[PDB]
Amino acid sequence: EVSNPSKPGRKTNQLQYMQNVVVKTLWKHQFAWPFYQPVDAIKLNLPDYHKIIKNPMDMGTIKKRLENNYYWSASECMQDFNTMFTNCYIYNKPTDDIVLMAQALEKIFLQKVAQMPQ
Binding site for ligand VYJ (CB under 6 A): 34-35, 37, 39, 44, 46, 88, 91-92, 97-98
> Least separation, in Å, of the C-beta of 106 and ligand VYJ?
12
Q: 29 near 19, Cβ under 8 Å?
A: no
> Least separation, in Å, of the C-beta of 52 and ligand VYJ?
11
The residue type found at 2 is V
Closest CA to 33 of 101, 116, 117: 101
Closest CA to 23 of 84, 96, 112, 117: 112
> Least separation, in Å, of the C-beta of 64 and ligand VYJ?
16
Instruction: Give whichever of 17 and 65 is closer to ligand VYJ, judged by the CB atom.
Output: 65
> Least separation, in Å, of the C-beta of 90 and ligand VYJ?
10
Distance of CA 12 to the CA centre of its chain: 19
d(CA 62, CA 28): 15
Instruction: Give whichever of 13 and 38 is closer to ligand VYJ, judged by the CB atom.
Output: 38
Instruction: Give whichever of 52 and 75 is closer to ligand VYJ, judged by the CB atom.
Output: 52
Instruction: Give whichever of 16 and 55 is closer to ligand VYJ, judged by the CB atom.
Output: 55
